[PDB]
Design a protein around this ligand. Structure first.
Ligand code: HEM
Ligand code: HEM
Ligand code: HEM
Ligand code: HEM
Lengths: 141, 141, 141, 141
């Protein structure tokens, strides 16, 4: 699950993510494609991979909107993330390791945009993303 | 990473003993089943992932030849694998995958040698696959 | 959770593990200490790390007995592994990565001792061990 | 791994700009909180894990000096870190930990440079810490 201390910080962070979904999502994806170019192979339809690319902006908004949603369903994340797991696991064959590489990118996006990002807040987000990675990899079990 | 004199001797010894292609083909079949996401970029195999399939057999011949080139000059592996490393990034394979093939290969070595595959032998093999994994991830840009 | 196909194979494997707990456990630990010597730092009390060492044999039996037990509690692994999680997470500060390194060793122990170890059986065991690793790391969330 | 001419320039530039010790001390404080298990072998710190604690400060001075030695000769890092690599294995630290410190360091770089820490800069930093991580894990026997 998630610790009480970690649960609280996440509940509130979702409000911020939802509001800046596109800008943050686009930023997160651009870092992923930049740091790990092999991940571009999953996005065969995309024409560009910069944060300004409309496709990247549209997809980034959807990722962040999904994350904000999940913060409101921490006690039953399996049921909530079930479809996305099927999408990523069964359909796209997304390598579980990629979820972690992406989580590390999202954390930097948050550090660059949040007013403050203390070790405690960073810790809560890391454990939350670790939970998401685990659920999105469920189709492999 | 580097292997001691005893470990290098064991690895060369194993390579003289086993059937290069058959063991490699079985290692590939195992990686495809144990780690499902690894089949993603193997479109040329047209859904035929068994050790006895012609596609897998042809690919296994390529992989075993590369491993042999590594065993022949354990000191120049990183340099010799520069191209192949880049080749894998281009295709879109995650660096952690290299470790996974190393794992299924050691399972096949274990099934073949059984009780003579003791901790010391296992450690020599692991060290070898760790060196191969390093050389393949090194030239990722 | 675990897939039906994967669940079945695990249910039966527990009977074998329980019966060979000491021999297999001792073998699994010896491989861990051999492949990853830094892990010996957790066992400050041990005098030796060979599979013949009585301490290794006593500890190995307990690990395997715990695993066999867990195969009979696949639908509520959190509740079953709770104490061991606290032991490993809160008390010993066991690095989550170590659980995976150990799982890879256990798989080889099984491959060397089981009559047969097909990719399908290997797959089920891998996912089962992945679940155990996740639960033993729960105190960090 | 190796950095392009542009990436090496950025890294040397950052090292001239930031306060070596303070940023390193904050990176260590962050790793201890985000990844709790990392405090295990830091017994000399007697439970004081904050950036402003004398123990952390003294250790941070050692770590920053090593990083500086890497930045000074990016071509001979692996060779220069041979001893230090062995030193960490002896102590009992898991190789994956090196990547974790690299991550908290990039978060601190992000908090410092904010919006100027774009994907290109982030990629240069990641590539640098990946080279450092490799050099520290390379001499693990
Ligand atoms: C933090 C975890 C992630 C979340 C929350 C997430 C969420 C999403 C969402 C909301 C969608 C839209 C699904 C739909 O159409 O209903 C999506 C699609 C997709 N995701 Fe992810 N994703 C994540 C990580 C990844 C990673 C790491 C990769 C690969 C490197 C990936 C590759 C894709 C692809 C290729 C699509 C479909 C693209 C398209 O057809 O437009 N996702 N993801
Ligand atoms: C021990 C590590 C490995 C070795 C020695 C190795 C070696 C090779 C070699 C020699 C080739 C052919 C190069 C050419 O076309 O000229 C190849 C191709 C390829 N490898 Fe690997 N490989 C390794 C691991 C992996 C892993 C784990 C994956 C990922 C699932 C992978 C995916 C591929 C793919 C997709 C191709 C291209 C096939 C195509 O042409 O469509 N390799 N590999
Ligand atoms: C497959 C996962 C593992 C299982 C099922 C497992 C299970 C156990 C069990 C049953 C005990 C006895 C606990 C008690 O006294 O009540 C134990 C103790 C312990 N485990 Fe694990 N363990 C596992 C992995 C690890 C790993 C990877 C490490 C570290 C490399 C580790 C280090 C220890 C230590 C140091 C103790 C206590 C030793 C002593 O005081 O005698 N365990 N473990
Ligand atoms: C970017 C990677 C790192 C660098 C440059 C680095 C560098 C150093 C240096 C220079 C020393 C002192 C060597 C001496 O005593 O002569 C040291 C000691 C040590 N490092 Fe690291 N280190 C790194 C990552 C880590 C990580 C992530 C851990 C694990 C949590 C770690 C654990 C230790 C420990 C426990 C000591 C010994 C402290 C003692 O004397 O009790 N290091 N490190």
């Amino acid at each position: 699950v998630l610790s009480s201390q970690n649960k609280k910080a996440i509940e509130e962070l979702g409000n911020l993510i939802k509001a800046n979904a596109e800008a943050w999502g686009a930023d997160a994806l651009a870092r992923l494609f930049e740091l790990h170019p092999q991940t571009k192979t999953y996005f065969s339809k995309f024409s560009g991979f910069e944060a300004c690319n409309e496709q990247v902006k549209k997809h980034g908004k959807r990722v962040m909107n999904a994350l904000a949603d999940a913060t409101h369903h921490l006690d039953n994340l399996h049921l909530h993330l079930e479809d996305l797991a099927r999408k990523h696991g069964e359909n796209l064959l997304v390598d579980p390791h990629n979820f972690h590489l992406f989580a590390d990118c999202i954390v930097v996006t948050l550090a660059v945009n949040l007013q403050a990002f203390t070790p405690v807040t960073h810790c809560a987000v890391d454990k939350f993303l670790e939970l998401v990675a685990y659920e999105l990899s469920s189709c492999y079990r | 990473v580097k292997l001691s004199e005893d470990q290098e001797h064991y690895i060369k010894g194993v390579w003289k003993d086993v059937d290069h292609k058959q063991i490699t083909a079985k290692a590939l079949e195992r990686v495809f089943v144990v780690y499902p996401w690894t089949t993603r970029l193997f479109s040329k195999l047209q859904g035929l992932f068994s050790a006895n399939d012609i596609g897998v057999q042809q690919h296994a011949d390529k992989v075993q030849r590369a491993l042999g080139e590594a065993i022949d000059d354990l000191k120049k592996v990183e340099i010799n694998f520069q191209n192949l490393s880049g080749k894998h990034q281009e295709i879109g394979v995650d660096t952690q995958n290299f470790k996974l093939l190393g794992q299924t290969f050691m399972v096949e070595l274990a099934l073949h040698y059984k009780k003579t595959f003791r901790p010391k032998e296992h450690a020599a093999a692991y060290k070898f696959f760790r060196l191969v994994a390093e050389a393949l991830s090194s030239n990722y840009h």
